[PDB]
TrEMBL record:
Protein name (record): Putative O-methyltransferase
Signal peptide annotation: none
A biological process term (GO) from this entry: methylation
Pfam families: Methyltransf_3
Residues that coordinate or bind dopamine: 32, 136, 160
Residues that coordinate or bind Mg(2+) 2: 56
Membrane-spanning parts: none
Gene (name only): safC
Amino acids binding S-adenosyl-L-homocysteine: 60, 64, 82, 110-111, 135
Classification via PANTHER family: CAFFEOYL-COA O-METHYLTRANSFERASE 3-RELATED, O-METHYLTRANSFERASE-RELATED
Residues annotated as binding Mg(2+) 3: 133, 159-160
């Protein structure tokens, strides 16, 4: 049973707290259930690379942002390109509760517009890490912009790259989101600009380290 093993990973390794628990419950009741193991991995990766400045695309109720910001130093910053207006007050409340609201710079609005502004700014090539969880049709655009935005040696992370297994399912034909993911996953395999690892965790997580050239 894969369900019993997934339950065991959560029971035996997730370091939860009432802030994270409440945010997952509140998000579940809105009109995907948050996988806590993924936020915890993101926090570990931030610490492992000694990240100080990170980029996020998606944000939603701010769970990944909260995990990321808690792993940063006090002077650390997250530029959070938020695609959900409806939920900013939720995200803000949990960031304030955790004492990290001052580390998070919210950029609400179209992701393409935000990333174009960032590439055309002093922020280009300064990010230690970028985390992308957004509309799958746009992943190639987000990846290409993250590659310009992160420093050499920086880490790009694309979430949900396994898309409920649809990428592997031969019966899924004519679906724009699945086709876009199949294209970007295939492109990353042979992209000499990065080191790659695709993880099965929480609906797939692709790690791409920008090579120094
Ligand atoms: Cl390298
Ligand atoms: Mg996100
Ligand atoms: Mg995932």
């Amino acid at each position: 049973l894969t369900q019993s093993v997934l339950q065991y990973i959560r029971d035996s390794s997730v370091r939860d707290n009432d802030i994270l628990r409440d945010l997952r419950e509140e998000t579940s009741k809105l009109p995907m259930q948050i996988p806590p193991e993924q936020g915890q991995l993101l926090s570990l990766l931030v610490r492992l690379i000694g990240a100080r400045k990170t980029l996020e695309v998606g944000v939603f109720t701010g769970y990944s942002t909260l995990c990321t910001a808690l792993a940063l130093p006090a002077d650390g910053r997250v530029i959070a390109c938020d695609l959900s207006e409806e939920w900013v007050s939720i995200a803000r409340r949990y960031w304030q509760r955790a004492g990290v609201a001052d580390r998070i710079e919210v950029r609400l609005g179209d992701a393409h517009h935000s990333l174009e502004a960032l590439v055309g700014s002093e922020h280009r090539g300064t990010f230690d890490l970028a985390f992308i969880d957004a509309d799958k049709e746009s992943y190639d655009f987000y990846y290409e912009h993250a590659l310009r935005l992160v420093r050499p040696g920086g880490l790009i992370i694309l979430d949900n790259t396994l898309w409920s297994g649809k990428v592997a399912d031969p019966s899924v034909v004519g679906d724009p989101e699945t086709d876009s993911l199949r294209r970007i996953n295939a492109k990353l395999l042979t992209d000499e600009r990065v080191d790659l690892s695709m993880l099965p965790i929480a609906d797939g997580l692709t790690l791409a380290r920008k090579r120094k050239l």
